[PDB]
Amino acid sequence: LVQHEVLCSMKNTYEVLDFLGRGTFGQVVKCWKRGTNEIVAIKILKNHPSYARQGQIEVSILARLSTENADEYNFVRAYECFQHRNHTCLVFEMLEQNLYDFLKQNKFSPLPLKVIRPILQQVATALKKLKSLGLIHADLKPENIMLVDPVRQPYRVKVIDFGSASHVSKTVCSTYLQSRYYRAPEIILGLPFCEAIDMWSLGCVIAELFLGWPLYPGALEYDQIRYISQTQGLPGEQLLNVGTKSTRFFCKETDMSHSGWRLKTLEEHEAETGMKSKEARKYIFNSLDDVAHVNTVMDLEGSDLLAEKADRREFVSLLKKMLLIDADLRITPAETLNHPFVNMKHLLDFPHSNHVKSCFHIMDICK
């Protein structure tokens, strides 16, 4: 169960100092490595047989990632893995603050695109290495992207929480998987999924950093697929046909001139499940292009505004490619690093803008 005040390792030695967090399963606690000046995070896993298979596969993925010991691809370095009492725990490096707590303390104010760009490049590099190994993170949320040091190393991030990671398999998710606000349509509709469910999650977080609030903050999976379809259009017919959960949110309407699929109205869903659906979006978009026209009051003069408008033009261009409902056509982590928003090739067309001089400056410092 829960423990405190002291801990014991087989090869090293750790003394627990303060609790760090508690999830659905698996507790993380901050401790001090005795004999050194290092602070590390230890994630304990309860020794229940029904959770033993998920606990073992997480250790298998960390050992395969630890071969990439350089971790220049921005991963949390896993040190060792021992067993205390009858439980199995993992030792990670101690990062400072995750992106959600960074937005919370700033009253969820939007972040400029010049700060979003370094974070996007680092996470896309991580997902480029995850596809290189045939792995899925399956839990990419702002709570799982932590800043190494917000003051010493400004805007350097790493990804955490592999408790949902798994190898690529041709198996439909039986129920739910990723976090709801960042869940790909494949998991909602009951479709075969691969590594593209993290490209969808990365689109919902860079949009959350730009707006301050989640892009699709649906309380239920119906609200989630409703916001997506109302903003980006209904999913394709071939996708809704082979979708297992596709019948729980859509219906086969057949008028004289109607097509095949349509959404269940708020009146229909409220009668089917009894739950009245309320609006939770801070931003309602008829199109992803309306994201570029959000929060448009800046101090940028004519020289800098011509570039910020070009910056937003490429941000919604990448965001649309990252939020394509069809996972077969969704942009890949390798292509995202080659998108003009990350290449900054569209900012080169400006002779000397004092804003683009800072945009390029924030990028080459993240090293």
Author numbering: 184 to 550
From the paper:
HIPKs are regulators of various signaling pathways and involved in the pathology of cancer, chronic fibrosis, diabetes, and multiple neurodegenerative diseases. Based on a database search, we identified abemaciclib, an FDA-approved Cdk4/Cdk6 inhibitor used for the treatment of metastatic breast cancer, as potent inhibitor of HIPK2, HIPK3, and DYRK1A.
One HIPK3 monomer forms the asymmetric unit cell of the protein crystal. In the structure, a continuous polypeptide chain from residue 184 to 550 was determined for HIPK3, exhibiting the classical kinase fold as seen, e.g., for Cdk219 with an N-terminal lobe (197–278) and a C-terminal lobe (279-526) including a fully ordered activation segment. Another 24 residues are resolved at the C-terminus extending the chain to position 550 by two helices (αJ and αK) that form an α-barrel with helices αI and αE of the C-lobe at the back of the ATP-binding site. In our crystal structure of HIPK3, the conserved tyrosine Y359 constitutes the only phosphorylated residue. For HIPK3 instead, we find that the phosphate group of pY359 forms a 3.0 Å salt bridge with the side chain of R431, which is part of the HIPK specific insert region. Unexpectedly, the structure of HIPK3 adopts an active conformation with a fully accessible ATP-binding site even though the kinase is in its apo-state.
